[PDB]
């Protein structure tokens, strides 16, 4: 194989998914120069959960999925495997035996608007915490009250999604951070994504 990975389409695409509806891209049949990503000072976080980031160029991967979404800066701590809080509980869970990378960078000049960019949402409510790599799109009205509810709204009933209000004057931690999670599997199956060893 000789053609390079679509990392430009993953890391530089104009608009990312909302974290409740995190987008997945399958990477296959290509060369993956991870030194081009890892040497980049723009990533505020590049944490790997079953490999060293220096060794990624000496490995070949079974299948690779890149998961793309936007979150608040104080919530980037929740994307590590075994963490908990409304993002890890209700919209994006990693399994405790996750093998892969979490890569995150501040987007305040990209995702943040002087009137508030309300285009990005998270899941504020869910009957039960979601399973590893599940995604819940459903906008059924959540019921916090003891009585059942019907129609669009009620007392102690809530719309389950909430938008994040990103402004360029938000304090760091309330600014938007883009996340990419790379979720490969290693050395035990036939492989299709390759570090650039000849």
């Amino acid at each position, epitope marked *: 194989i000789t053609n390079l990975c679509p990392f430009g389409e993953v890391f530089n*695409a104009t608009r990312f998914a909302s974290v409740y509806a995190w987008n997945r891209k399958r990477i296959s049949n290509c060369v993956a120069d991870y030194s081009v990503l890892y040497n980049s000072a723009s990533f505020s976080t590049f944490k790997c959960y079953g490999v060293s980031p220096t060794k990624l160029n000496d490995l070949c991967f079974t299948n690779v999925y890149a998961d793309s979404f936007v979150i608040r800066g104080d919530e980037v701590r929740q994307i590590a495997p075994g963490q908990t809080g409304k993002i890890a509980d209700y919209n994006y869970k990693l399994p405790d035996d996750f093998t892969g990378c979490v890569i995150a960078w501040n987007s305040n*000049n990209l995702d943040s*608007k002087v009137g508030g960019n309300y285009n990005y949402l998270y899941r504020l409510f869910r009957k039960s915490n979601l399973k590893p790599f599940e995604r819940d799109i459903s906008t059924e009205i959540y019921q916090a009250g003891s009585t059942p509810c019907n129609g669009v709204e009620g007392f102690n009933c809530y719309f389950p999604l909430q938008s994040y209000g990103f402004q360029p004057t938000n304090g760091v931690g309330y600014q938007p951070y883009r996340v990419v999670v790379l979720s490969f599997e290693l050395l035990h199956a036939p492989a299709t994504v390759c570090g650039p060893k000849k």
Partner: antibody
């Protein structure tokens, strides 16, 4: 090789309707908004609305709201603009244009890839 | 709405002259502006985006600057392929265009 290919010249009576089409190719059709922009003879550009080809959601400029309808057939990567109850000054070149796949802001519209434009003539 | 005005409605300029065209928004638009060129008989082309980010593969002579209500587009030395109408466009609230500035060659 990204491209937007449109229907040929349209000619219409007053009070009728027109169906311009925009066949996309060379990129994933669901990835970005398709805007509809028009240009009257010897005059400036005018944005009509957009369709998000993934969700089918649309937004219009106020002048066209209740006149323009935007739709899409994802099975043939074709976006459509339907304009109803046509008046003489709807005589214009109608373009579809894509909303920049990379390097922009997440809000911003742009118009990075444009179709060839379809002339509509509205007259008695 | 946000109404936009371009100061020269047309501007005659010689080959090798510096061209400056200014676009003013009625509201404060921060840096939410794009610039497009339309050569005679073609669809428009995006040249600058986000008020000053030069697009991929366009000539280095093209510049954009300013923020707030008042913005500029510039050609550092005009070349005879630059002749067309130049339009500014806000993106703060529904993408409105400006009236367009025609360039022409001075003779």
């Amino acid at each position: 090789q990204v491209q937007l290919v449109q229907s040929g010249a349209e000619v219409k009576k007053p009070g009728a309707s027109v169906k311009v089409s925009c066949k996309a190719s060379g990129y994933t059709f669901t990835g970005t908004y398709i805007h509809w922009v028009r240009q009257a003879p010897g005059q400036g550009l005018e944005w009509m609305g957009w369709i998000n080809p993934n969700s089918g959601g649309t937004n219009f400029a106020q002048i066209f709201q209740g006149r323009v309808t935007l739709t899409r057939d994802t099975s043939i990567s074709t976006a459509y603009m339907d304009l109803n109850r046509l008046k003489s000054d709807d005589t214009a070149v109608y373009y579809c244009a894509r909303d920049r796949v990379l390097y922009g802001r997440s809000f911003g519209w742009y118009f990075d890839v444009w179709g060839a434009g379809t002339t509509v003539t509205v007259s008695s | 709405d946000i109404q936009m005005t371009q100061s020269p409605s047309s501007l005659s300029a010689s080959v090798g002259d510096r061209v400056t065209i200014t676009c003013q928004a009625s509201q404060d638009i921060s840096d939410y502006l794009n610039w497009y060129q339309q050569q005679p008989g073609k669809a428009p082309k995006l040249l600058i985006y986000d008020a000053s980010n030069l697009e991929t593969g366009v000539p280095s002579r093209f510049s954009g600057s300013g923020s707030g209500t008042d913005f500029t587009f510039t050609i550092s030395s005009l070349q005879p392929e630059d002749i067309g109408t130049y339009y500014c466009q806000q993106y703060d609230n529904l993408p409105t265009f400006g009236g367009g500035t025609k360039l022409e060659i001075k003779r």
